[PDB]
Symmetry: C3
Subunit: 483 residues, 3 copies
């Protein structure tokens, strides 16, 4: 007659790693890391991204006339700019603080386009001839739809021109202007006139006054001229005054805007936009998961799991799987017993110790999930060629946190896996010892997990062991004789 | 006759969490997190903060004439600027590199105000008419006390004016100037004259040259004109030359200054300043604590504990409290209860109790030691055209806060489990040392206790507690009882 | 007749710390921290550093004529600038975006110097008199070799001058120019002429247009004038046009360059450059190590271990050294000592010893693996008006240093405790496997050892070591002894 102590086994081939041992097969486990994504852009909080098509952010927002599909009021959860977009700043020059403009635009939610200064505002000049072969529309010469290239009437001198606009709404207004710099005095004279020329812009809180910086430069997009483009934000209540006697590229249309309550982004990607929804939308695709880590992309909007470099984060929940060892036959629970007597034989799990282990492991998993429920958020702000130091500072920082979090996740998994599997060993040992202490020398150890009884142990003697009430003196005499 | 093994219990209702289970009552514990603060500003290393009252940093340092309460030499451990302060830049315009000025000012310790360029410096011009209704003093038109608004004499043209000052001391000098921009050419002509006009400032190591940017703008504080305000630092030994033919807002008074040996700050707060001292002074109050973490504020000066988001960080030191345990023990953590003809009673095991005390004390101190650094957030400001670096600073500050909060919270959960396990193992060790000695001269009982198969006197029992029992002495007597 | 269970000891005096106790002597250990370096600068990936000697980066790259040792084509893995270097910007003035130039230069690996605009490009002007006593060569007045200081011929007016250059190669070109600002109108007229004067530079992607900002400034290096120096990069395909009627300091020679595929650096150090190679080269010396941590310097190029503040990171691999343990074992970590009629001796248990070796080895390697990443501090410079970003870079660098130092030091304390506990458990397991087998045909002794109640030959003893003993064979012979 005998009783054994053992633990669950099954057909699982899933492995985990621990601090002491690699490739350890276990009976149950949980993958904390999400590796899958749909390669496309979906709506976030039911709001669609804005696809810039063949236009850059600058082409869109300045109104490059190849970008008419985008013209007007828009709203978006994020922006998708195609890497090979060809329609941007078509008449050559520089946009001042371009990178800060993009950061502004990535924080915006909705825009309403409106005519800020109609052509009629500018008297004694030609407002209908400011076009260039650099900015074509259907083969023809054209120009930015948000800017007005004013020139002199051929017969007449360029009049002093003035315009004013007041922001009487509760929304800020994003607007644009520029200063044109011809390549030589002949062209200056033709378009504006000789002498001192100025472009002046004034607000309660910004002042601007500049002139042509004439110089012959190599042609870009077929032009030897250049424009310095500027942008600004006219705050609620503020008023703008414009004066010029030449070289003004005037604001024409502008944008009343709202700032998002949510983090937005400009993604530079060729991925398709489709009719779908995502809780989590990364730069390289949408993720639908309830896992807490993710190795898809560090750049996203919505609610995403923490990004890490790991390929897997497999957390052991069950036991070492060692069949012949463990008992494939148990099935009821994690730890338990196998008995053999005259009434028969069989397996039966110990409910108490099994549940305690379930409760602890469950709590461990949830605690890890809970404590890992924050994300470091990388951002795709841009930096100019004269901003290498801050660009490098941003990169080292983002890689810095990535390395810390990847380390924290991987190390924790290795260490707690070892603990979890040790806890199981200890739980099994505990049951075996409780049986040991009870039977004393009315049974033989066998160094096996099992005990050979020195007496007959019926189905009530055996259940007397499972509830921990055995009674040694009852079989003491019977046992001592067999020797 | 019997001997038992047990562990301490008490009346404690303090709970801790562990990785495996929550709300576990324990006998002793230590809160690592400080949550309390006095809602005020105190002295730090015995130096008081400077209260700017109804002035902004800029109103103060430019010498807005409503800020005379601050005028002159001052010294401070930190600066307190009130959120509603009304006296700042009164004549409209921008201070260039305003945010970098503030960072500088937060790093300064003491200033001494002095006349850098007296009015007599500027010949052939009017130095006594440069006042405005935008900057009022006692119902009158006035102007910044540290700047001089020079205009042309009506009858005469604005002479080329020159002035020079040499820093012959060992302290750097913080000084200010500006360029005035009238709204139109009429005003430009009246005050300065037409033609190209410049303001040029030169040092051994910096040059500045700028002109009027004339533009008709909406009024601000009743003025259509603007000033671009500038600041700079004249180093020891250096000389400043000033040259202008118009539009100059000249430095008048300036500040010799010392840089602090300590970290300083500008706090934007309404909290009161009081007669008190603080080792640790945060933006939302003073902390007096020997704890190593703190959830009050990430911004401070002095020596403060590490900031974390946690509401609590309770580290178990004692045992699971299950009164099970013996409320009767009291002497120590682990021990014995005996019963014989001479009587009964509890007595702690000194050796194993002290070893546990030493380990737990060492663990606490080790954690304290390794957590004795702080990440320091700063309240530097960023302009509207510095959103990228501002966001970079924010993500970084939140980034370290999240790593430290994680490290602290997880460590507490994990070590709480280990600490309570260690206690279990220690109790079992004692019980086994007794088992091994008595063999079959006592019965286990599966109880923690042992029923002796013989009589065990107060010397037999103390023979167990020191680990020298002698089995053969009672071997016969024990085997007879069956 | 007896059998004992014990563990290895030796003469080791090496100590480690754990979370529960300090200064614990152990039998084997490994130091994870590298503290040694060679105090010199070596080649990295086969390429030598460039030693700037008595020149600053700027003196070199502008071609200060006292820097002819450096003149022409050069290549380097990193740059070494000496702290007391004197030959820099000799004619006083400011280099615009100087700090960003240095970052660029640190990222470059080869340059080829070439004449971009020969003197003949500028007609109707004096190209052979642009020298100053501020920039001496062999006692004589001279000038930067990469710039050309053009002045008017005395008899003639300064002609409009033009030049153009097109980059027809695949490499970018780094070039320089400047605008001269004389101290007064007399000198302006003498050198260039009166009236409006301009310096215009144009590319497909950049435009520049500026004039003299005339002002009398204190003399620096004997000069009241100044030059604003500029730099830029002409990309492959681009063409540069230059137009001026005065005040132009023209590019003369420039540098075609390649960008390194590897991180480079400018080290400010007096350490000697020698004939050696380093995998890892830090600012304070070369490191050759296989260790994973390092407390030498946070600034480096090449492949270096992670920087931390620690003085030591000693990881226990072996046992607590208590000679207790058996100095006599030597064969392994855990094992047996037997005594019978055939003799006596020690013998390690191979199975349990190997399992422990495998786990500890795996632990060490896992730690090494997970610590195989480095945060890299950089020595970019920041101007006086960049205190905020400079402080941001510093707090960030110190932030990660503190996190990694903590992670390393805490991990070592915690795993040391686990490692030493694992050994205790392994020994106990063996002792119990022998207890269970012999039952009461041996006496425990409470000692680690077992006195056999019978004769146990060299086959009886090996019958214990493989776990197959057979109690009934000797059971009777036991019960006799009573
Ligand atoms: C995130 O990790 C997964 C694997 O755990 C990576 O996906 C595997 O990539 C390899 C090589 O690219 C393929 O052969 C496997 O079939 C992929 N596995 C799965 C589940 O897709 C994935 O590359 C990781 N993401 C990134 C950006 O590296
Ligand atoms: C400061 O912390 C120390 C330990 O970090 C605390 O010291 C204990 O304080 C109580 C009395 O308040 C004593 O009974 C203990 O004996 C002290 N422990 C040790 C190890 O010395 C102290 O309480 C803390 N101070 C405050 C104000 O909370
Ligand atoms: C890194 O730590 C090492 C070793 O702990 C330091 O080198 C020791 O310096 C101390 C104090 O000057 C001396 O007791 C020993 O002579 C040194 N020991 C060894 C092994 O070198 C070293 O200073 C540290 N490095 C830095 C940059 O602080
Ligand atoms: C609980 O008991 C002791 C004395 O029996 C007492 O001194 C102690 O203060 C009590 N608990 C608390 C929280 O005060
Ligand atoms: C633990 O106790 C707190 C109150 O002290 C309670 O809010 C919480 O629900 C409890 N949690 C569990 C799991 O018992
Ligand atoms: C921690 O500080 C917060 C301030 O954020 C405070 O409101 C809270 O009460 C603190 N935690 C506890 C347990 O008091
Ligand atoms: C996964 O689903 C559970 C529902 O029990 C939810 O509470 C948890 O937050 C989900 N995961 C994530 C990452 O939000
Ligand atoms: C251990 O402790 C003492 C101070 O308590 C110290 O002086 C000694 O040098 C330490 N030993 C080692 C090896 O660190």
């Amino acid at each position: 007659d005998k009783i054994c102590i053992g633990y669950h086994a099954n057909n699982s081939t899933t492995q985990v790693d621990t601090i002491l041992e690699k490739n350890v097969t276990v009976t149950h486990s949980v993958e904390l890391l999400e590796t899958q994504k749909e390669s496309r852009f979906c709506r976030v909080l039911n709001k669609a991204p804005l696809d810039l098509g063949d236009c850059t952010t600058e082409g869109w927002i300045l109104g490059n006339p190849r970008c008419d599909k985008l013209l007007g009021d828009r709203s978006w959860s994020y922006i998708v700019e195609r890497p090979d977009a060809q329609n941007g700043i078509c008449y050559p020059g520089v946009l001042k603080e371009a990178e800060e403009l993009k950061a502004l635009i990535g924080s915006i939610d909705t825009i309403q386009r409106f005519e800020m200064f109609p052509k009629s505002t500018w008297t004694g000049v030609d407002t209908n001839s400011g076009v260039t072969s650099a900015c074509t529309y259907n083969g023809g010469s054209s120009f930015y739809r948000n800017l007005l290239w004013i020139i002199k009437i051929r017969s007449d001198p360029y009049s002093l021109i003035k315009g004013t606009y007041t922001n009487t709404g509760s929304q800020s207004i994003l607007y644009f202007w520029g200063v044109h710099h011809p390549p030589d005095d002949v062209e200056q004279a033709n378009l504006y006139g000789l002498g001192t020329r100025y472009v002046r812009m004034g607000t309660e809180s910004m002042n601007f006054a500049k002139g042509p910086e004439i110089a012959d430069r190599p042609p870009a997009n077929g032009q030897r001229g250049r424009i310095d483009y500027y942008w600004s934000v006219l705050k609620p209540g503020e008023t703008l005054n414009v004066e010029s006697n030449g070289n003004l590229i005037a604001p024409w249309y502008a944008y009343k805007f709202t700032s998002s309550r949510h983090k937005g982004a400009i993604f530079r990607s060729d991925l398709p936009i489709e009719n779908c929804d995502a809780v989590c939308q990364t730069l390289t695709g949408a993720i639908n998961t309830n896992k807490t880590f993710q190795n898809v992309s560090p750049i996203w909007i919505g609610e995403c799991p923490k990004y890490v470099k790991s390929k897997s984060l497999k957390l052991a929940t069950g036991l070492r799987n060692v069949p012949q060892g463990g008992w494939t036959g148990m099935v009821d629970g994690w730890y338990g017993y196998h008995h053999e007597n005259s009434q028969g034989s069989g397996y039966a799990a110990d409910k108490e110790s099994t549940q305690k282990a379930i409760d602890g492991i469950t709590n461990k998993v949830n605690s890890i999930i809970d404590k890992m429920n924050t994300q470091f958020e990388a951002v795709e702000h841009e930096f100019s060629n004269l901003e290498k130091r801050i660009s490098n500072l941003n990169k080292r920082m983002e890689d810095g946190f990535l390395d810390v979090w990847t380390y924290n996740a991987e190390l924790l998994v290795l260490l707690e896996n070892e603990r979890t599997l040790d806890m199981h060993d200890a739980n099994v040992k505990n049951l075996h010892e409780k049986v040991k202490s009870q039977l004393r020398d009315n049974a033989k150890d066998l160094g096996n997990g099992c005990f050979e009884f020195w007496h007959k142990c019926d189905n009530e003697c055996i259940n007397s062991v499972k509830n921990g009430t055995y009674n040694y003196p009852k079989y003491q005499e019977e046992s001592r004789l067999n020797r």
